Amino acid sequence: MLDAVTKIINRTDAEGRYFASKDFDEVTRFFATGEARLRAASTISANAASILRESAAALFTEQPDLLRPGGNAYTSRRYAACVRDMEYFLRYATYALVAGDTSVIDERVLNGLKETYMSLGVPIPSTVAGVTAMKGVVASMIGSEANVYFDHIAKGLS
Amino acid sequence: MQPIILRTLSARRPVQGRPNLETYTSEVERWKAIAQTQYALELAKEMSRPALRT
Ligand SMILES: CCC1=C(C)/C(=C/C2=NC(=C\c3[nH]c(/C=C4\NC(=O)[C@H](C)[C@H]4CC)c(C)c3CCC(=O)O)/C(CCC(=O)O)=C2C)NC1=O
């Protein structure tokens, strides 16, 4: 995986050049926002259980048919797999928020997830709706700082 | 005016205050729970129907 600084390093290395003024400006901008991102990550970590609880509540309030018999979230096992997926999304979005780069989501989350969901019959639009509900919860909790990362997960499924 | 007429007789009730109703409140809560169960059973019957068969 990469973070923002390693991404800038790779960008300057592909061109075979030392860091210039713009590169140092970008790295400084990343360092300046680090305290805020760490605060957001700690805030998410402190309330991960409650975020997950109310995110699943929102998802299954919007689409009750998933819980009903014949729905893709009807069994103890499939409900558990669903909330485990949402917990994965929250944790890896927090990782990406700390890193400032989405490569952790590509490496650890979207490595065959869309194929898995199409194979198992998991409804992708419902999963994106749940991811969006969690994005809204986290945004109301800490602000817009993490929205993009959740959108990334959505774009990996859509 | 010399008949004995009594004006201000004391009342039956005692001077104390109202006894507390915690045990009565508990039994009322029990009745509430019993009544809630009979509606929750119907709504639960609704919850266990299949998903997309409207
Ligand atoms: C750490 C990285 C990681 C991810 C991302 C991950 C997701 C993931 N979810 C899976 C299944 C699943 N995923 C879901 C969740 C869906 N149910 C729908 O109703 C919802 C819309 C939606 C979630 C919001 C369900 C129900 C299953 C079970 C599928 C089945 O057994 O038929 C599977 C197949 C194997 C298994 O069930 O354990 C994977 C690999 N696993 C991982 O190790």
Q: What CA–CA distance (Å, rounded) separates A12 from A16?
A: 6
Q: Ligand 1 center to residue A78 CA distance, Å?
A: 8
Structure letter (DSSP) for residue A100: T
Distance separating alpha carbons of residues A44 and A89, to the nearest angstrom: 12
DSSP class of B2: -
Q: Whose CA is nearest to atom 5 of ligand 1?
A: A109
CA–CA gap between residue A92 and residue A153 (Å, rounded): 10
Chain B: give the shortest CA distance to residue A90, in Å. 28
Best substitution site from A109, A120, A152 to test ligand 1's pocket, by max atoms within 8 Å of Cβ?
Answer: A120
| SS3 track for A13-67 | HHCCCCCCHHHHHHHHHHHHCHHHHHHHHHHHHHCHHHHHHHHHHHHHHHCHHHC
DSSP for residue A146: G
Closest CA to A154 of A142, B51, A136: A136
Q: What is the resolution of this structure in A?
A: 2.5
| DSSP at A109 | T
Separation between Cα atoms, residue A129 and residue A15, nearest integer Å: 40
Ligand 1: residue whose CA is nearest its atom 23:
A82
**Ligand 1 pocket, residues with Cβ under 6 angstroms:** A 66, 72-73, 78, 81-82, 85-86, 88, 108-109, 113, 116, 120, 122-123, 126-127, 130
Using the 8-state DSSP alphabet, how is residue B24 labeled?
A: H
